[model samples]
Target: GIGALFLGFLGAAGSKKKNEQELLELDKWASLWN
Candidate 1:
């Protein structure tokens, strides 16, 4: 059970990191037009 929990936490962290990357890209594009 503990191992499963740790794997799930890693998955969540990966998703959060990807989301942050996407947001950064959006901000970069927005700056280009402004």
Candidate 2:
């Protein structure tokens, strides 16, 4: 159960990073086009 919990936490953390990267990319594109 501990290993499963740890993997879940890692998955959540990775999702957060992916979301942040997507936001940054959107901002860059908006700035470039505007």
Candidate 3:
């Protein structure tokens, strides 16, 4: 919850915590790709 807030983004608990965290991690690595 706080992570998204800090990131300034419904990035949390929209469906479930698992998906939320996974989406965050996906963005994390995706950023590294740039």
lDDT scores for all predictions? 0.58, 0.57, 0.54
Per-residue lDDT tens digits for candidate 2, residues 1-34, read: 9999976855544433234556654554456788
Task: Report each candidate's C-alpha RMSD, comma-separated, in the order given.
Answer: 10.6, 10.7, 7.2
Candidate 3 residues 1-34, lDDT tens each?
7876856544432432334556765665567788
Off by over 4 Å in 2: 15-34
Query: Model 3: runs farther than 4 Å from truth?
Result: 1-20
Compared with the true structure, what per-residue lDDT tens digits does model 1 show for residues 1-34?
9999976855544433234656654554466888
Evaluated against the true structure, the overall lDDT of model 3 is 0.54
All candidates in order of TM-score, best leading: 1, 2, 3
On a 0 to 1 TM-score scale, where does candidate 1 land against the true structure?
A: 0.36
Backbone clash total for model 3 is 0
lDDT for residue 9 in candidate 3, whole number 0-100 = 43
Candidates in order, TM-scores: namely 0.36, 0.35, 0.32
